Amino acid sequence: MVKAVAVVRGDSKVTGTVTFEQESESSPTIITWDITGHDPNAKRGMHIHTFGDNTNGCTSAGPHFNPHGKTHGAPTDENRHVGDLGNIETDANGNSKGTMTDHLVKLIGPESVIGRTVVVHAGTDDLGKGGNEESLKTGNAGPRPACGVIGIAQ
Amino acid sequence: YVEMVKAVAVVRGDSKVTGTVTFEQESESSPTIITWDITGHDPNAKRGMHIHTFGDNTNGCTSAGPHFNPHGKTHGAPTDENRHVGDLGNIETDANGNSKGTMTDHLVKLIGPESVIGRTVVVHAGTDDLGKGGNEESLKTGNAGPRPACGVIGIAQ
Amino acid sequence: EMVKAVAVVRGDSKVTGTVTFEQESESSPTIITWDITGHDPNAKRGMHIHTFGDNTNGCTSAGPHFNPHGKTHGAPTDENRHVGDLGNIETDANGNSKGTMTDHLVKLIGPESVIGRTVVVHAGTDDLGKGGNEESLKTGNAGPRPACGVIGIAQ
Amino acid sequence: YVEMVKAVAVVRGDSKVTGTVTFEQESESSPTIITWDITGHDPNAKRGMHIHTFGDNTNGCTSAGPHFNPHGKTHGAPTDENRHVGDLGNIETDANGNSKGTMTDHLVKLIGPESVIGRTVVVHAGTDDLGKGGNEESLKTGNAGPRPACGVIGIAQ
Amino acid sequence: MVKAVAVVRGDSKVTGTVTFEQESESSPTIITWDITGHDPNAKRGMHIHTFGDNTNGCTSAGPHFNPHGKTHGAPTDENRHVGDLGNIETDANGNSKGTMTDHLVKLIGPESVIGRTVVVHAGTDDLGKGGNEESLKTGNAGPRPACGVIGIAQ
Amino acid sequence: MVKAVAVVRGDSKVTGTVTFEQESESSPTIITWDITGHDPNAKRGMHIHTFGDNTNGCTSAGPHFNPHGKTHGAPTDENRHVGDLGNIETDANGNSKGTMTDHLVKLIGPESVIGRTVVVHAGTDDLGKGGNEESLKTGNAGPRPACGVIGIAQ
Amino acid sequence: MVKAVAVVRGDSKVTGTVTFEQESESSPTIITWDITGHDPNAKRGMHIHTFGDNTNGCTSAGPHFNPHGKTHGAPTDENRHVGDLGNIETDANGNSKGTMTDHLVKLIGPESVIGRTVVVHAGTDDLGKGGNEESLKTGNAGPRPACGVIGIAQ
Amino acid sequence: MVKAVAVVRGDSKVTGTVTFEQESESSPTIITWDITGHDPNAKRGMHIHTFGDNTNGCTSAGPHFNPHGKTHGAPTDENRHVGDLGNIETDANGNSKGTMTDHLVKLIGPESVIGRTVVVHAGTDDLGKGGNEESLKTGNAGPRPACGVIGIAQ
Numbered sequence A, E, F, G, H: 001m002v003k004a005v006a007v008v009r010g011d012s013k014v015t016g017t018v019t020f021e022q023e024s025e026s027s028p029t030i031i032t033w034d035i036t037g038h039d040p041n042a043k044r045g046m047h048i049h050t051f052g053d054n055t056n057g058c059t060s061a062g063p064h065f066n067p068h069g070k071t072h073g074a075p076t077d078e079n080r081h082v083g084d085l086g087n088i089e090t091d092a093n094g095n096s097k098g099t100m101t102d103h104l105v106k107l108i109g110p111e112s113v114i115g116r117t118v119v120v121h122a123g124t125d126d127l128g129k130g131g132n133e134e135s136l137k138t139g140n141a142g143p144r145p146a147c148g149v150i151g152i153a154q
Numbered sequence B, D: 001y002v003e004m005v006k007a008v009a010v011v012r013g014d015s016k017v018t019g020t021v022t023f024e025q026e027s028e029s030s031p032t033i034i035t036w037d038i039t040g041h042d043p044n045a046k047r048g049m050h051i052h053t054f055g056d057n058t059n060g061c062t063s064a065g066p067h068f069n070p071h072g073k074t075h076g077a078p079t080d081e082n083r084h085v086g087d088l089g090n091i092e093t094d095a096n097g098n099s100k101g102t103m104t105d106h107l108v109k110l111i112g113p114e115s116v117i118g119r120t121v122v123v124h125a126g127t128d129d130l131g132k133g134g135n136e137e138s139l140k141t142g143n144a145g146p147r148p149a150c151g152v153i154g155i156a157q
Numbered sequence C: 001e002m003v004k005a006v007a008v009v010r011g012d013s014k015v016t017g018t019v020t021f022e023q024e025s026e027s028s029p030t031i032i033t034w035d036i037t038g039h040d041p042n043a044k045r046g047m048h049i050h051t052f053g054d055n056t057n058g059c060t061s062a063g064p065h066f067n068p069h070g071k072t073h074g075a076p077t078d079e080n081r082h083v084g085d086l087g088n089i090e091t092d093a094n095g096n097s098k099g100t101m102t103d104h105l106v107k108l109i110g111p112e113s114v115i116g117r118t119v120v121v122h123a124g125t126d127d128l129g130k131g132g133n134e135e136s137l138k139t140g141n142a143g144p145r146p147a148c149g150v151i152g153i154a155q
């Protein structure tokens, strides 16, 4: 029913598209990514950050979207940010195509991620198991080579 | 909980036109204040600026689709009753190709079912004829020409 | 070919007069001449061809602007106009208006013929579809219909 | 050239509900007169009848899509200002499950850009709550239930 | 980018869908059909009839749609009805799928076929070369096993 | 079988005709109005009032015809007066032409409205949903610019 | 646990007190009102508006408190604003005493109404059933004779 | 950096403030209005009139400020009076809050509007497109329910 898309780019060669589909507010959101230009054979963090603000590049996206005030985790963790989409897997060409079904992310209602930002990170998300404050906030997934605002799609 | 919403579109595309268009709305019942700060356009020009329906940049600014038009009107001036929500008229560029301005709009909302959050600001290459051009295109797009820059309206802090 | 028509307009008003039409062939422009009296002085007044040559209820039964191409209301020179959109006539200090113009959409010959339809002289100014409201794109906000006449075949 | 338009939807579907819904409009400025002659429905019942956006029957009455809503309103009663064009309320069936009636509607048009020619009449399985149900579904569909019969609104002689 | 579709059926086993796409009023209309249940290895007339009226089955569709007042012909003829889509070719299974680009049929404007009827006929259209009055009216294409009103598609 | 008509006029420029047709006592009554001279782009109450008494203008029509002792409602409401015909819609010229099928109004039998009064009101009928006692009586539809007695038409 | 109170007044003779108690965040909030000086024998809307801002009288309270982004409805509706508390009933003297719980209004947690405003309106809330756009925003309950900021009570 | 303000009032309940700020003579002037007490849901003309003279109420403000000798127009028009600020939009409560960027109005230099008058009109400005002499002079925006002299604000 509701469809959204982020076209990500940044101060890097990482580009691509992240789409979102959600039938109703209570339904899972299906998230597809199609990323190119990343490091090969890598695990790279991908998160929804709070602000769809690109005024100062991907930095103004702010932190991970966390309406429920949880610690950073894996998508499979109960204690995760809404925006915690884990690591995407890049192939030998630095590309990553994938789909996930997310049970926290909404396109509908007060916690909608429409208008927020998808960030593809430079590093691996430690999924909140890094044992430091930074892990519980960001997963230590490194800088932000590409981001894009989640917009309404046809 | 905060009712106030701030949003920003950072616009760019296949051109030198860049800049930011900010939106602030205090409540669903209030007008939205729009501020633009555009650079790199033609000098001394009137250039159409509109909210287009889709925040989809997969095919560049073309995939933003048409003007945001939830109320099913024809294209018009911002002051017209018969206008698209997305019809913000023209911005004025100075001798350097820059445009800074601010205005409220009474149809553009950040809050509620007609929210433009996640939709697209397009800065056009030409002048919006404000639906007064006398042809069908005028009542669709204002004949404002192509889309040198666009950006998705995203939530700001 | 060489078709001539005339509407003698009157109504619930002092506005009266004659509007003549001539058309050489179906594709030719129709030459329109009006000679109107009894209107407001120094005024711009809409003059349109409305769809029906029905005067059963005064000028109201003439219906809307003649619009066989399914367009919105506009100026005569607009692409996006009704066939019946003849714009405004100008009245002089005495409330009189004489003028002539051709129109490239109005036909007396063929399927879109206006013979048997109605000329309406309106009470107000046609905004030529530029008024910025929905009514502008229907009627031009030209107001009521002080005079009308069915377009009839002339000798 | 004739301005008058007559149209008819001949409705059927995965049910015993059949019949005809005719539309007549004298001019773009006039209301449209709607006449229905429905058979095979539940007896002594109120049943929603709406114009849905698409005249697409490729997957049965589901392909007609939602209520025709060019003006971007929520679902309502025909007499409501805030209604879909397609909101024709309920028809009444008699003791035999038949419904014959006629009314004009002031939003449904056969002429002009909001023409319903080529769209779909759906006769619903349940009662239209006229947008007064207090839930989001009421403001979308009137909670009128599934679509036992539909037909494309076609031009009549 | 107007799209239309007719779903055809009638007092026969002939069913299927006929779609129409037209970019603008002056652009050609692309027509696609997907018909099943017809005679095998046959040429079968397919026309747009004037009325989208199914009150009396396919008979109520009236004659071929002919706003320009021409005689019946092949789609390639200058002198044809707007509704003259010629013959479709059915395969060994009685099925016919095809696409044509039609330079007269419109979905936009006063001659729009939206709300009119596609009829699939029982016989072969003689394309107005039958030499009788009926040929110049109907192509002698026989009865009307299936029809459907051309409706607006998403 | 029975046809009736009311020609409405009063202390105003509102005039017009309201016609009634009923095949049999249990059949719905079809009501058609053709009203001119009202406010433009407005919703205006129209009701059948009990008395076809115009001795003191539209006031002596008395209240809404309510043989079944209901509260004031919309025509669609189960709780409505027989005379509750709801709002008519006026166009940009203050004209209203419409037709409705009414399942309570009768021209035949003991609850016949023949000889009663159609009133066209000056304001909008709140349909019994105004939340005060007057709403449940009159719909708060304002004064009575025009009325006419429902007379036998054939 | 948490108790709160609004003392309402404004550009009118309407005054009074609206108290709130909530045992836990998920518990219903118990609301009691004791209002004086209103119209007699009337239904009058009473709502929690978003802002506890009285800088420009009751207008500064803004719209109905609507953190879930719904339309205006009755308290019992699924589709309602958090602040939609419907109508209070005034007696023959213009007074209204009553108590009810509400299942959406909270004093505890992120949707707390503490520091927001109770508005007693001049007219009747149509509960979102008015059939116009304003009904789905305000209930058409009219102006704001009294309001008060919801403050922590002992 | 000049700031100005007009506090408008008159023979009406229309009141409010109109502020002006301009960085330099060639810069646009930002104009903000906060108007209350007007007709609801309306378009109302707002203009700068030549004279900051209130000796005869808003009438002594004279005509639209027109130092460049143009016809009356919309703010967006080449052919407009300096004082032509077009229509403001009032909400359901008759309030209008807005901001505009005006490319002709100056607070600095010989065409300064400091000491001139903001008038809020009773009717809609036809923006010079009413087709009569008055339209090209005043926009036919009607009488002057409120006005105020533009005064230096810092």
Ligand SMILES: [Cu+2]
Residues within 6 Å of the ligand: A045, A046, A047, A049, A064, A119, A121, A138, A141
């Ligand atoms: Cu991140």
Ligand SMILES: [Cu+2]
Residues within 6 Å of the ligand: E045, E046, E047, E049, E064, E119, E121, E138, E141
């Ligand atoms: Cu045929």
Ligand SMILES: [Cu+2]
Residues within 6 Å of the ligand: F045, F046, F047, F049, F064, F119, F121, F138, F141
């Ligand atoms: Cu009454």
Ligand SMILES: [Cu+2]
Residues within 6 Å of the ligand: H045, H046, H047, H049, H064, H119, H121, H138, H141
């Ligand atoms: Cu003025």
Ligand code: NA
Residues within 6 Å of the ligand: A075, A076, A100, A101, A102, A103
């Ligand atoms: Na998951």
Ligand code: NA
Residues within 6 Å of the ligand: A025, A106, A108, A109, A110, A111, A112
């Ligand atoms: Na949500």
Ligand code: NA
Residues within 6 Å of the ligand: A121, A138, A139, A140, A141, A142, A143
């Ligand atoms: Na990181």
Ligand code: NA
Residues within 6 Å of the ligand: B006, B007, B008, B022, B023, B024, B156
């Ligand atoms: Na911003």
Ligand code: NA
Residues within 6 Å of the ligand: B030, B031, B032, B105, B106, B107, B108, B109
């Ligand atoms: Na707004």
Ligand code: NA
Residues within 6 Å of the ligand: B005, B110, B111, B112
């Ligand atoms: Na919001």
Ligand code: NA
Residues within 6 Å of the ligand: C010, C011, C012, C013, C014
């Ligand atoms: Na006369």
Ligand code: NA
Residues within 6 Å of the ligand: C063, C064, C065, C139, D029
């Ligand atoms: Na008309």
Ligand code: NA
Residues within 6 Å of the ligand: D006, D007, D008, D022, D023, D024, D156
């Ligand atoms: Na029909």
Ligand code: NA
Residues within 6 Å of the ligand: D078, D088, D089, D090, D091
């Ligand atoms: Na109905």
Ligand code: NA
Residues within 6 Å of the ligand: E127
């Ligand atoms: Na052949």
Ligand code: NA
Residues within 6 Å of the ligand: D033, D102, F032, F098, F099
């Ligand atoms: Na009728």
